Amino acid sequence: GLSDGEWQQVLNVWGKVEADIAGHGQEVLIRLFTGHPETLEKFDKFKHLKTEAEMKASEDLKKHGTVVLTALGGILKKKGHHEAELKPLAQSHATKHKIPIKYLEFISDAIIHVLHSKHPGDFGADAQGAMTKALELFRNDIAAKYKELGFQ
Ligand code: HEM
Numbered sequence: 001g002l003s004d005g006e007w008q009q010v011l012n013v014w015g016k017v018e019a020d021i022a023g024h025g026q027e028v029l030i031r032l033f034t035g036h037p038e039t040l041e042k043f044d045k046f047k048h049l050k051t052e053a054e055m056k057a058s059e060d061l062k063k064h065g066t067v068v069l070t071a072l073g074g075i076l077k078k079k080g081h082h083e084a085e086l087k088p089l090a091q092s093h094a095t096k097h098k099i100p101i102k103y104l105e106f107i108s109d110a111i112i113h114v115l116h117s118k119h120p121g122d123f124g125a126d127a128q129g130a131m132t133k134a135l136e137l138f139r140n141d142i143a144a145k146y147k148e149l150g151f152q
Helices: 004-018 021-035 036-041 052-057 058-075 084-093 101-118 125-149
Strands: none
Touching: 004 021, 004 052, 004 058, 004 084, 004 101, 004 125, 021 036, 021 052, 021 101, 036 084, 052 058, 058 084, 058 125
16 A cells, blocks of 8 residues: 555656666566576576576567566556456466466565666665555565465
């Protein structure tokens, strides 16, 4: 649960992402894959990537970063009223991709890391607080659907 002022911060931060969605999406995925190499094994289409240089050169990885962040941005713009948008993603990630909730924690922290890396000094303490709460809400509502499905 976020206040109106917290949502305003979230959507202000998101404007930084929307100026370069592919560059942010690429870096989020690279941070996820290099920090937590077990996550790469869930992607049949990226498991061939052995080095970060190959990851950086991969246009398909940048494409997938765009898909991921476009979906997250659509959810965030709902300011918590995201049941219809979140349900299919929860279902696909539990039943088809088999993504443990832990990996959603990993990517949440990676988003925070990338924002500080690309906007040093321009991602303030209030903005970090609001973004973190928004990603926690997203993860918590996914977790509820995972529990319904019995997925661990
Ligand atoms: C911010 C969180 C994330 C969002 C919004 C997101 C969004 C999406 C979307 C929109 C798709 C394509 C449609 C679908 O299959 O449902 C996708 C595919 C996928 N997601 Fe996620 N995702 C997230 C986190 C993750 C994480 C943490 C992993 C694994 C570590 C992951 C693994 C996958 C995989 C394996 C695919 C299929 C890729 C393919 O082969 O084309 N997702 N995701």
